[PDB]
Design an enzyme around this catalytic site. Structure first.
Site, PDB file in Angstrom:
ATOM      1  N   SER A  42       0.778  -1.255   0.000  1.00  0.00           N
ATOM      2  CA  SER A  42       0.000   0.000   0.000  1.00  0.00           C
ATOM      3  C   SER A  42       0.802   1.294   0.000  1.00  0.00           C
ATOM      4  O   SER A  42       0.206   2.359  -0.078  1.00  0.00           O
ATOM      5  CB  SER A  42      -0.908   0.067   1.216  1.00  0.00           C
ATOM      6  OG  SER A  42      -2.025  -0.790   1.043  1.00  0.00           O
ATOM      7  N   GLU A 142      -3.759  -8.169  -6.344  1.00  0.00           N
ATOM      8  CA  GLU A 142      -2.581  -8.833  -6.936  1.00  0.00           C
ATOM      9  C   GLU A 142      -1.229  -8.243  -6.526  1.00  0.00           C
ATOM     10  O   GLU A 142      -0.251  -8.975  -6.380  1.00  0.00           O
ATOM     11  CB  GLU A 142      -2.676  -8.854  -8.462  1.00  0.00           C
ATOM     12  CG  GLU A 142      -3.706  -9.833  -9.034  1.00  0.00           C
ATOM     13  CD  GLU A 142      -5.139  -9.303  -9.000  1.00  0.00           C
ATOM     14  OE1 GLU A 142      -5.356  -8.090  -8.748  1.00  0.00           O
ATOM     15  OE2 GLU A 142      -6.057 -10.121  -9.231  1.00  0.00           O
TER      16      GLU A 142
HETATM   17  C1  XD2 Z   1      -1.915  -2.048   1.464  1.00  0.00           C
HETATM   18  O1  XD2 Z   1      -0.697  -2.568   1.846  1.00  0.00           O
HETATM   19  C2  XD2 Z   1      -2.997  -3.005   1.811  1.00  0.00           C
HETATM   20  N1  XD2 Z   1      -2.546  -4.373   2.039  1.00  0.00           N
HETATM   21  C3  XD2 Z   1      -3.323  -5.421   1.759  1.00  0.00           C
HETATM   22  O2  XD2 Z   1      -4.420  -5.345   1.228  1.00  0.00           O
HETATM   23  C4  XD2 Z   1      -2.654  -6.798   1.957  1.00  0.00           C
HETATM   24  O3  XD2 Z   1      -3.033  -7.720   0.985  1.00  0.00           O
HETATM   25  C5  XD2 Z   1      -2.859  -7.374   3.328  1.00  0.00           C
HETATM   26  C6  XD2 Z   1      -4.101  -7.735   3.774  1.00  0.00           C
HETATM   27  C7  XD2 Z   1      -4.310  -8.274   5.040  1.00  0.00           C
HETATM   28  C8  XD2 Z   1      -3.253  -8.486   5.880  1.00  0.00           C
HETATM   29  C9  XD2 Z   1      -2.025  -8.148   5.424  1.00  0.00           C
HETATM   30  C10 XD2 Z   1      -1.813  -7.581   4.163  1.00  0.00           C
HETATM   31  C11 XD2 Z   1      -3.702  -2.491   3.014  1.00  0.00           C
HETATM   32  N2  XD2 Z   1      -2.733  -1.817   3.807  1.00  0.00           N
HETATM   33  C12 XD2 Z   1      -2.325  -2.108   4.994  1.00  0.00           C
HETATM   34  C13 XD2 Z   1      -1.389  -1.204   5.651  1.00  0.00           C
HETATM   35  O4  XD2 Z   1      -1.055  -0.294   5.064  1.00  0.00           O
HETATM   36  O5  XD2 Z   1      -0.917  -1.456   6.653  1.00  0.00           O
HETATM   37  C14 XD2 Z   1      -2.792  -3.173   5.720  1.00  0.00           C
HETATM   38  C15 XD2 Z   1      -2.253  -3.405   7.095  1.00  0.00           C
HETATM   39  S1  XD2 Z   1      -3.518  -4.006   8.259  1.00  0.00           S
HETATM   40  C16 XD2 Z   1      -4.034  -2.553   9.234  1.00  0.00           C
HETATM   41  N3  XD2 Z   1      -4.440  -1.376   8.801  1.00  0.00           N
HETATM   42  N4  XD2 Z   1      -4.648  -0.744   9.829  1.00  0.00           N
HETATM   43  N5  XD2 Z   1      -4.432  -1.369  10.848  1.00  0.00           N
HETATM   44  N6  XD2 Z   1      -4.078  -2.490  10.554  1.00  0.00           N
HETATM   45  C17 XD2 Z   1      -3.683  -3.628  11.494  1.00  0.00           C
HETATM   46  C18 XD2 Z   1      -3.789  -4.193   5.148  1.00  0.00           C
HETATM   47  S2  XD2 Z   1      -4.897  -3.454   3.920  1.00  0.00           S
END
Ligand code: XD2
Length: 265
Positions: A42, A142
């Site tokens: 992200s 992806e």
């Molecule tokens: C951007 O990195 C995006 N990541 C994902 O969608 C991954 O596929 C993912 C999903 C679930 C678990 C791990 C990875 C999103 N971004 C982020 C982030 O920037 O940190 C997350 C982290 S989870 C979070 N967000 N806030 N608090 N927490 C804990 C997952 S969605």
């Protein structure tokens, strides 16, 4: 020695860690695996919002974007909630940065437009800032899933730090659009346990996180000392040794940040 400390953390978390802090007047650059590729995850959403801001008049933030059930394919804490009403470009930028909203980011890529659902235009934007390293090839979900070592959807701690420096501290954006990006990153809800956790409370921290498969955990920040001296901090990590389902480790980034903060204080 910083490198010894960074290597210790890699052993502790069975991880690969990358760190870059660009040089300033009085501090040398801090670099550890800084030119190795790591997945954006992200973190791309910060330069993405900048590209959208740059590309359009400020009042484009008020354009309503509509989307449907089949557009929700990833973690989307805000967009899932407003699927019935639509979201303005402004709301989408807010969600993408502050909640790391995947659908919001996909829609912003579409707004940017062109080949690859906006990924080519995104990459073109980075190129215009002199980044010849980074590439975005896919959208969510992806983009988080490329095998370790694969160059698709990667940046380096060095490249992204120089990009963020231009966006927040330099002249990549006009002051009004720059403030919008800065404020969103300042109000981020996802970064409390990463770079923020490693810097004392009297330092200002603004950031954008990334998390992915193979234990990927990233954070890119701009920090300001209690006297207003700014530094850019990029920390990236993965844990290929646990395979696809390796747990991301926020604590690694907090410890890496603590080590950096100790040098910068
Ligand atoms: C951007 O990195 C995006 N990541 C994902 O969608 C991954 O596929 C993912 C999903 C679930 C678990 C791990 C990875 C999103 N971004 C982020 C982030 O920037 O940190 C997350 C982290 S989870 C979070 N967000 N806030 N608090 N927490 C804990 C997952 S969605």
């Amino acid at each position: 020695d910083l490198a010894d400390r960074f290597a210790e953390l890699e052993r502790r978390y069975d991880a690969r860690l990358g760190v870059y802090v660009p040089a300033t007047g009085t501090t040398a650059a801090i670099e550890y695996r800084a030119d190795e590729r790591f997945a954006f995850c992200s973190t791309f959403k910060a330069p993405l919002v900048a590209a959208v801001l740059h590309q359009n008049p400020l009042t484009h933030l008020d354009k309503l974007i509509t989307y449907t059930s089949d557009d929700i394919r990833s973690i989307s804490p805000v967009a899932q909630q407003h699927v019935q009403t639509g979201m303005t470009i402004g709301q989408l930028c807010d969600a993408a940065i502050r909640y790391s909203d995947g659908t919001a980011a996909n829609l912003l890529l579409a707004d940017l437009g062109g080949p690859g659902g906006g990924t080519a235009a995104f990459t073109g934007y980075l190129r215009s800032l002199g980044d010849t390293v980074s590439r975005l090839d896919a959208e969510a979900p992806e983009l988080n899933r490329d095998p370790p070592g694969d160059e698709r959807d990667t940046t380096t701690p060095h490249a992204i730090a120089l990009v963020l420096q231009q966006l927040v501290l330099g002249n990549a954006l006009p002051p009004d659009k720059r403030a919008l990006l800065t404020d969103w990153m300042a109000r981020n809800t996802t970064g409390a346990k990463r770079i923020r956790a490693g810097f004392p409370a009297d330092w200002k921290v603004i950031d954008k996180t990334g998390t992915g498969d193979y234990g990927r955990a990233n954070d890119i920040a701009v920090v300001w000392s209690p006297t207003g001296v700014p530094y850019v901090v990029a920390v990236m990590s993965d844990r290929a040794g646990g395979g696809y389902d390796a747990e991301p480790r926020e604590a690694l980034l907090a410890e890496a940040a603590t080590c950096v903060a100790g040098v910068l204080a």
